[PDB]
Structure 1
Amino acid sequence: STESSIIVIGAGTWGCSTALHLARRGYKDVTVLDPHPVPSPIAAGNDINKIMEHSELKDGSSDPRSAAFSTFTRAALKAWKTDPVFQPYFHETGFIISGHTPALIDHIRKDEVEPSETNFVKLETAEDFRRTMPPGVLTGDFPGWKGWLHKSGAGWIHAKKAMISAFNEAKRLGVRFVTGSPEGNVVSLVYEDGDVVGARTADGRVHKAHRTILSAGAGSDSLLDFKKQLRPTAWTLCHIQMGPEEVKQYRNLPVLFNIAKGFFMEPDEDKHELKICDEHPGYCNFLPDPNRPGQEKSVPFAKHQIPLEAEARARDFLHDTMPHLADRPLSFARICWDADTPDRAFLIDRHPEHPSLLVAVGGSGNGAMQMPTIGGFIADALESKLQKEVKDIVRWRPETAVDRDWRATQNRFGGPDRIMDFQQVGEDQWTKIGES
């Protein structure tokens, strides 16, 4: 009931959304635990921008997984446009998806464009690309590039400020946040008679609840045996600081994304920094799995640098698109952790062996744009009224992860077109921003 005690582990993208939605449904006793103050330095959703896109599928070209995803993004788009908690942070500037070989371009055509009801604008030449943004922004030769522009129902979101907005509103509606170490740093789930009855934090305190929701992003994989359903995987981002005049052209830009090179989004309003992500299948940090002798398990760590090879990939993206920026010094960089499920659908379900536990994990590279509404679906799952087509897709499904190949590229491209391992990156082979 709305009087039952609930604990949410993780005050990131999905945890803050969940807290807000539970408060909105009249839940009176909700406590959220995080080792860090919002926004957490290790939250994937702690980012000056993320991509938001919604596409409806053609009737004749639907499958269950993509139909479920469309249901998530349909709700998200409506909320980004109408919910005052989120509306200020959605910039509906459009979204370009592109590649630079015939194989990549065909893949996009077949998987993204043809199944979709969206009316795309086709971009055939370098001039087509450059004309999508104001003069002086795109200056590159886009060698071999073709792609498609989705003009509306897409853009970017200020994920960090949207998360803070949700946090603030959830507090206003009476949600208690314990965010800080050691008091919010959960070190174990607490079991009694085969069920989860709450969480233990690093201060020794045991927090008891009628329901416990595990929404701690990539860090969740350390708190529960997910039976290989989660792969903690990292991607890489860097910023360039734009100057006070030049930055004024760089406004209201569609997202530009080449699925095997990277993407950038327009400079932020606060620091005037332009973010580039270099696209690749991801880094893992493969260490011995303590519970599975002879096996490996990807284990997150935090770092505000990126591998030199990642910087180089970013500068190659800039060469193609904005070569006037390709030699600019980085003002900031970091690695950023999410977790992939085996099919890269979300994992939102009550645990079959521990029914008081709900897991809400597996953003799989697509969780941030869900922020406004994901907590509603998670609350639905808590209340056993998650609609069936979504439910069946995001169910607990360890049978799909038996003998998982951690080095599967899972429909990502770029760089060496394989999963990379941070254990193979030399200590001296990182960016050194702010070091000298």
Structure 2
Amino acid sequence: STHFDVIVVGAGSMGMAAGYQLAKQGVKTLLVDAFDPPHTNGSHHGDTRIIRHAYGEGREYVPLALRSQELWYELEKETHHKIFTKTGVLVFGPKGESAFVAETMEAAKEHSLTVDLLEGDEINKRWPGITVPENYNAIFEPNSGVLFSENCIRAYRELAEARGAKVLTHTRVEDFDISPDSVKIETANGSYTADKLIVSMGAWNSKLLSKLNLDIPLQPYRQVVGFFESDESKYSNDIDFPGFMVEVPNGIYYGFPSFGGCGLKLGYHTFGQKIDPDTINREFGVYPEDESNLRAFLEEYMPGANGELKRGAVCMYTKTLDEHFIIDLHPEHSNVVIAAGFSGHGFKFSSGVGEVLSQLALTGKTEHDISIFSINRPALKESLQKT
């Protein structure tokens, strides 16, 4: 007998932030998750996430990144959980041969972001532990950094629940019944109704959006990260070793300084195994590339951070064809909001996206510019199943 104002399906990075934003405004909200967030079956574990501001992916991203940053600072003040550490983020690559580095520099210039430009040995000198060729250049953002992602979700959940949000765990939503004036979800633990629906199922959006009559190319990828024993005198956050995202000949890599001796963390961004979220092997090391692609980068660029493997994690990216997000109202139902395809780089924006989702669910519009995330854009190749 319990109707809600808004139901959020998938209470992870995006959904839990949305739940917090809704609860904060006195909106009767129900968040439903297949597990118990934060957990290790989706896209938010592995402890840390990079937040950068000079987003060359598209100008719309910078404002969202800056708003999210302010929102993370707000979250830091509201909870006892640690949210953000300002490690700074270093971006480097071969001079004149990296679109990623080039776009980053252009984005910083275009938005007047504070950054340091350096190249060659200046990089190796500023950060002992980094060894790049002399023909490499870099752009460093001193004011961006690292978010403790599980902590963020945990905090948003505690804050949302304190304000009345209900969270139904270990409950997989299996189907949807949408009406012009109400929404309804079906689960093994029962059916629930509300005036509005927010769908943010992460990797599972690739399998369940069809239940909403949507056909959108979304490919989940198995993405691992490893924590390695390192020279703490060089790679510790305490000696200001930065978070980083860089481009080398074989692709893009991202990493984090050692925090409290946990070891430098590294991930290979441009490669991953195509998988299904319900059959993915979540054990690190089952594929030789898991560990070898990481050490190949470390032995060449951060040689003192190539020690014993201390820990591994397996997580997922869900990509759209253009690698831009999907944040929009369902094309046939204005009372349904979709958040999907974050393509491996959405966590830093989750605070801002929660705000956008809240606005879309409550008003059908948002003050943020989200045109590049339109569910109707051509590059997405979106279509309805029944037309």
Q: CA deviation at 1:325?
A: 3.2
Whole-angstrom CA distance in 1 between matches of 2:25 and 2:208: 28
Q: CA deviation at 1:196?
A: 6.9
Match of residue 170 from structure 1? 160
Count of residue correspondences: 368
Match of residue 30 from structure 1? 29
- Does residue 1:372 correspond to 2:360, yes or no? no
Structure-2 change in CA distance of 1:281 and 1:299 (3 Å): farther
Whole-angstrom CA distance in 1 between matches of 2:208 and 2:181: 14
**1:129-148 aligned within 5 A:** 129-133=123-127, 135=128, 138=129, 140=131, 142=133, 144-148=135-139
Match of residue 222 from structure 1? 207
Structure-2 change in CA distance of 1:254 and 1:139 (3 Å): closer
Match of residue 237 from structure 1? 225
Q: Deviations over 1:367-407 (max 9, x none)?
A: 11123232111111112353476242222226433399xxx
Q: CA deviation at 1:250?
A: 4.2
Judge conservation of contact 2:55–2:104 (CA < 8 Å) in 1: no
Judge conservation of contact 1:278–1:310 (CA < 8 Å) in 2: no
Q: CA deviation at 1:4?
A: 4.9
- Per the normalisation by structure 2, the TM-score is 0.84
Q: CA deviation at 1:257?
A: 2.2
Whole-angstrom CA distance in 2 between matches of 1:359 and 1:264: 30
SS of the residue aligned with 2:373?
coil
SS of the residue aligned with 2:168?
strand
Q: CA deviation at 1:311?
A: 1.7
Judge conservation of contact 2:200–2:339 (CA < 8 Å) in 1: yes
Deviates more, 1:161-170 or 1:48-57: 48-57
Structure-2 change in CA distance of 1:227 and 1:388 (3 Å): farther
Q: CA deviation at 1:248?
A: 8.7
| Match among 86, 92, 117 for residue 86 of structure 2 | 92
Structure-2 change in CA distance of 1:299 and 1:341 (3 Å): farther
Judge conservation of contact 1:347–1:362 (CA < 8 Å) in 2: yes
Runs of 4+ in 1 over 6 A off after TM superposition: none
Judge conservation of contact 1:247–1:272 (CA < 8 Å) in 2: no
Q: CA deviation at 1:32?
A: 0.9
Whole-angstrom CA distance in 1 between matches of 2:279 and 2:335: 27
Whole-angstrom CA distance in 2 between matches of 1:74 and 1:40: 27
SS of the residue aligned with 1:276?
strand
Supply the AA of the counterpart residue of 2:255. Answer: F
Judge conservation of contact 2:7–2:30 (CA < 8 Å) in 1: yes
| Match among 299, 307, 317 for residue 319 of structure 1 | 299
Deviates more, 1:328-337 or 1:209-218: 328-337
Match of residue 121 from structure 1? 116
Q: Deviations over 1:214-252 (max 9, x none)?
A: 111111222112422433233221122569x76994424
Judge conservation of contact 1:300–1:337 (CA < 8 Å) in 2: no
Whole-angstrom CA distance in 1 between matches of 2:15 and 2:338: 11
Once superposed, what is the RMSD of the aligned Cα atoms? 3.0
Match of residue 340 from structure 1? 319
Match of residue 188 from structure 2? 202
Runs of 5+ unmatched residues, structure 2:
none
Judge conservation of contact 1:142–1:320 (CA < 8 Å) in 2: no
Q: CA deviation at 1:338?
A: 2.4
Whole-angstrom CA distance in 2 between matches of 1:66 and 1:261: 18
Whole-angstrom CA distance in 1 between matches of 2:179 and 2:363: 22
Q: CA deviation at 1:302?
A: 4.7
Q: CA deviation at 1:277?
A: 0.5
SS of the residue aligned with 1:36?
coil
| Match among 103, 109, 116 for residue 97 of structure 2 | 103
The alignment-based identity, stated in percent, is 19
Match of residue 10 from structure 2? 10
Whole-angstrom CA distance in 1 between matches of 2:205 and 2:125: 43
Judge conservation of contact 1:195–1:353 (CA < 8 Å) in 2: no
Supply the AA of the counterpart residue of 2:59. Answer: A
Whole-angstrom CA distance in 2 between matches of 1:121 and 1:332: 32
Supply the AA of the counterpart residue of 2:117. Answer: K
Match of residue 58 from structure 2? 66
Match of residue 54 from structure 1? 53
- Per the normalisation by structure 1, the TM-score is 0.75
Match of residue 43 from structure 2? 44
Runs of 5+ unmatched residues, structure 1:
58-64, 287-297, 405-436
Structure-2 change in CA distance of 1:302 and 1:162 (3 Å): farther
Whole-angstrom CA distance in 2 between matches of 1:93 and 1:159: 15
Supply the AA of the counterpart residue of 1:10. Answer: G
Whole-angstrom CA distance in 1 between matches of 2:43 and 2:351: 15
Judge conservation of contact 2:336–2:361 (CA < 8 Å) in 1: no
Whole-angstrom CA distance in 2 between matches of 1:320 and 1:261: 14
SS of the residue aligned with 1:43?
coil
Q: CA deviation at 1:31?
A: 1.0
Q: Deviations over 1:310-345 (max 9, x none)?
A: 32121021112321332x332322332122223333
Whole-angstrom CA distance in 1 between matches of 2:310 and 2:13: 25
